[PDB]
Protein: Enoyl-[acyl-carrier-protein] reductase [NADH]
Organism: Mycobacterium tuberculosis
Amino acid sequence: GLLDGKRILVSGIITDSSIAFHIARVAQEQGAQLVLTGFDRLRLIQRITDRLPAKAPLLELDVQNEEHLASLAGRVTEAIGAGNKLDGVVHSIGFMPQTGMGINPFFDAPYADVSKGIHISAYSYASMAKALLPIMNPGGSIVGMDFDPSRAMPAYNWMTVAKSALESVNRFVAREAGKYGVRSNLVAAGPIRTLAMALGEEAGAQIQLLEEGWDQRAPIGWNMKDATPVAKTVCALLSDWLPATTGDIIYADGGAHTQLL
Amino acid sequence: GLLDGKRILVSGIITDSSIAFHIARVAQEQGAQLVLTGFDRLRLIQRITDRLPAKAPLLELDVQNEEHLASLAGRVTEAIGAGNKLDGVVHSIGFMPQTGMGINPFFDAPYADVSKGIHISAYSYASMAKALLPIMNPGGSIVGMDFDPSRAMPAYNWMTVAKSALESVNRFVAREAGKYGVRSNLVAAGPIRTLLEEGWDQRAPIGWNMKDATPVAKTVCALLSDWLPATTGDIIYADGGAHTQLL
Amino acid sequence: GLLDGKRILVSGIITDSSIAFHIARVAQEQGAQLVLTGFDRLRLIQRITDRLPAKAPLLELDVQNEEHLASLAGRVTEAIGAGNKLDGVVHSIGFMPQTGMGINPFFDAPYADVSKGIHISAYSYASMAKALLPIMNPGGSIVGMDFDPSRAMPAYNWMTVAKSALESVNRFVAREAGKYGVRSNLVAAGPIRTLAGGALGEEAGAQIQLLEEGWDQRAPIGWNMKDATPVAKTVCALLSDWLPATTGDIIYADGGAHTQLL
Amino acid sequence: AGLLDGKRILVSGIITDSSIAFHIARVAQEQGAQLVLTGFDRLRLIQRITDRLPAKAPLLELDVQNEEHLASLAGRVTEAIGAGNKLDGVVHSIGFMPQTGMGINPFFDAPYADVSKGIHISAYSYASMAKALLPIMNPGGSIVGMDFDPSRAMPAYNWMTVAKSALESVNRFVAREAGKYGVRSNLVAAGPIRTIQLLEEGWDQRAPIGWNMKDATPVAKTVCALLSDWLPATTGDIIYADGGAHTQLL
Ligand SMILES: NC(=O)c1ccc[n+]([C@@H]2O[C@H](COP(=O)([O-])OP(=O)(O)OC[C@H]3O[C@@H](n4cnc5c(N)ncnc54)[C@H](O)[C@@H]3O)[C@@H](O)[C@H]2O)c1
Ligand SMILES: NC(=O)c1ccc[n+]([C@@H]2O[C@H](COP(=O)([O-])OP(=O)(O)OC[C@H]3O[C@@H](n4cnc5c(N)ncnc54)[C@H](O)[C@@H]3O)[C@@H](O)[C@H]2O)c1
Ligand SMILES: NC(=O)c1ccc[n+]([C@@H]2O[C@H](COP(=O)([O-])OP(=O)(O)OC[C@H]3O[C@@H](n4cnc5c(N)ncnc54)[C@H](O)[C@@H]3O)[C@@H](O)[C@H]2O)c1
Ligand SMILES: NC(=O)c1ccc[n+]([C@@H]2O[C@H](COP(=O)([O-])OP(=O)(O)OC[C@H]3O[C@@H](n4cnc5c(N)ncnc54)[C@H](O)[C@@H]3O)[C@@H](O)[C@H]2O)c1
Ligand SMILES: Cc1cc(=O)c(-c2ccccc2)c(C)[nH]1
Ligand SMILES: Cc1cc(=O)c(-c2ccccc2)c(C)[nH]1
Ligand SMILES: Cc1cc(=O)c(-c2ccccc2)c(C)[nH]1
Ligand SMILES: Cc1cc(=O)c(-c2ccccc2)c(C)[nH]1
């Protein structure tokens, strides 16, 4: 069991297609004891999380709510049992209003929308670490989800900016986590056909070119309908097998980003 | 001169130590016709800009004020004259509340403070391009100020995250600017004493003087010129070559 | 164990301080079945490899010898048994004459010396893959050792150039390995006190001390140069099935030093 | 009042009038630079090509694989520019890779002897030229080399990619040496030029300001900008004159 006896917090489950769902499933398969955090539709998330191989407490967490962050540690402790701490934290949270991601021109995203997206997608990574590092064990691991933002691309627009910011946040979180003997890293994954992944002919064709370029580039290929390789990479970072890796990005994209054509 | 007859907008002058002040001075020395944008203390900024070698109209621009952005192009046109356009735009705007940049712990910066900083330091680069690209000429150049955020460091804290965001914004602005025949780039400058640093002069193969902004100002002018015509969505490093050296 | 039943080739053992020795030890502890390759002093290497927790066949491999590479696959097959293939290959080979790595000025390294170093440290990664990919299994993993060469530094000189070339070789090897369902990655490690101060004199002794001490200061989780286990563990992670979508890439086992400025 | 007025510059790498070096030399001359040219192997043919440049320039023989040429190069340049005068700029536009390590030939089928000759000419020689010409270079000087972005693998480019990865590393070490003379060292990572169809086509779409492979002037202009006094704080670095394609995914 890769994660045998490890207590791990998993945020970001909304559907069974969610990257977090797959992380949670693989982590449980690998012996982990999870705590799950959900946003807004908690009774709907519970029906989904009931599909996971093992039972796990579900706690409410809106990263934009300062009360949820202030009480999160006390609530996790109550769930895992007093005297027990977390060995891992998984941030699989992202959000960008349609104005900043999709068909809307780059220049037409109002800052209020961009700011909500950066708050949820990038700032919250620090918010979660701030809240959960006091209840984390030495040898611990914080993992976040990334989509390589080193180059501009169509449609992604302001979410590309939020990922650029998240990569910077990660590096600063590693400085803090280090003080606790905790590692902080991001998994930069290739495109995964979640429920969200209708937009019209132009954008439908844009996502087809990205998805098709990914598999051509990827020397080992890229299956967008399979989230298991991503989930297994997060679990590798949660394990004890990458003990000298922190403030870094691990690419689970089939190698696509290392190839030009 | 390097920018003879070029009409260039320069934002970010507050003191004579400001990076923008040096860009403006070197650009004027190189034949550029300037339009200057100031923020908040406009009568004070006019006292300071009067110190440059040539006269230049001063316009108010608060990047957080949507009215200023909506009228900016019409106000620049009025200043340079109807029928004339900008050949260059310089973004030398940055801000981060003390909670997000300095001795305050990284985790203690409230998001409202971080958001104001990202708005001013990163989002505004797109706001200025959106406002000024319709009144820009083919062959034009938009330049922004950067401080290499690729690796974390002490104190820079949330301003590093704003810089990381600005680098991403610049790559997207280049896609838009490109439709107008305009280049968009950032100058990742070394530390400058304008109103962390010592290792820079050692690391830099050609050295680094923090008390001198002229090498940074010159690089911005090179990017504003016609001598880097195939460079866009990129970062030019004017830091004495420190970022390429480990020790 | 992490590598239970996996047949893995490990090159680069010369002493028990060797990074490869630690990879081999951790891999055996994790259930791997090993084949070991040695250079020049085979009787010497056999004495060291006898210290590993399990017995493993030792084969001769000089990466500059074309006969050694041409017969390597047939020799590995003979050792693991016909009908069996490798699930992993570990390249822990590096060399740079004193002329190009150390106190000697950068400009004073003759090309013949630079070329031998690039041959051993960078070209050989492709040579090993060319030789061992026909006898590798889908799901396989080739791992190479790296030292972050993205920025220049004192004394590393031409070995930085060899690492810069090796990083490029790896990306091309991933294109080839990919056709076999094999991944190809590098572990960019922080400095480790292997067998290979005072020897270089005052000036350079102090230079390598600042470089080495900068790693623990920069690394948010610290850096112990007297410990190869974290590096060995990362190689094993790359050899496992837990990074299945990572290829042509570099994994940094440096305490996170390369992500920090100061 | 040209960009490079009165600057004495060495330009290596002219073989045809399609050569990137030919365009650097032409735009440098147009900008006031006094040039010294170095040629390889077919020197009488290289003289026929340089006679097409705007101004007269001495032509010297330089085979980067020849140790005698490198050892005498400085003395020969000094003789050409005049005793008491030094170089303000050096341009390395030299590259070579046998067909075994670049093209349709499988990556694994390139023998090391071929790879080594290519790395010698394309990467090591950048340090060889600096070693030879830095003693005869002025403070404020500039050494520029030609690059093709090797940060990601691609088809055909094969071992040449590895040579450019090595050259980028050599450039960073040359900056440490050049720095002692008050000299900068940089590379121009240029987009593709006709001096492969997917490279050449994919480039103009991705590049926000477009990319014309039939035009070397934008590349020549960037080299001249690096040779000028307008990038005085840039060393050990790479300037991308590629239309901006490398900053773009699609
Ligand atoms: N789907 C892909 O192709 C892909 C690729 C790379 C990276 N990612 C990243 O993976 C992560 C998860 O994406 P996914 O594709 O699994 O999508 P998803 O829609 O299943 O999950 C995003 C999650 O964020 C949560 N969330 C939104 N606002 C929140 C708030 N205020 N507080 C707390 N939680 C909030 C949502 O409820 C949801 O659970 C994101 O960071 C995303 O950017 C996705
Ligand atoms: N100072 C350095 O060492 C250094 C190094 C690299 C990059 N930079 C960057 O260079 C730029 C200029 O900084 P500086 O060092 O000249 O300092 P500064 O104090 O002179 O400049 C910052 C400018 O931003 C302006 N500004 C702030 N909020 C604004 C708003 N809402 N609307 C309009 N203008 C606003 C200020 O008035 C000022 O003119 C910044 O973007 C900074 O991040 C600075
Ligand atoms: N020691 C460090 O601090 C450090 C840091 C990062 C990377 N590395 C890398 O780790 C790898 C192994 O080095 P190490 O530190 O364990 O030292 P080492 O001396 O044990 O390893 C180098 C190995 O290369 C072998 N070798 C040399 N020439 C050969 C040839 N022609 N054919 C076959 N094998 C040959 C040697 O016999 C030796 O086993 C190298 O690639 C090195 O660059 C070392
Ligand atoms: N053409 C492109 O698409 C392109 C793009 C980016 C970079 N480059 C680089 O630009 C440089 C010049 O290439 P080019 O496209 O102008 O073609 P080219 O063939 O005209 O230039 C290469 C030059 O190197 C010289 N040379 C070769 N071996 C030599 C030796 N042993 N000693 C001395 N000189 C020697 C040749 O004589 C020739 O003049 C190369 O470094 C190349 O990699 C080319
Ligand atoms: C390829 C890709 C990357 C992402 O980050 C997201 C994403 C963005 C916001 C919220 C959730 C996922 C999507 C849908 N696709
Ligand atoms: C080294 C350095 C980098 C910067 O970005 C700024 C800066 C930050 C906000 C506003 C103005 C300048 C400073 C003062 N120094
Ligand atoms: C820090 C470091 C990096 C290296 O690559 C080697 C090395 C160089 C050549 C051969 C073997 C190891 C050493 C000793 N140290
Ligand atoms: C795109 C591109 C890159 C290069 O390096 C060369 C090249 C290779 C060897 C010698 C000269 C140029 C060419 C022709 N094209």
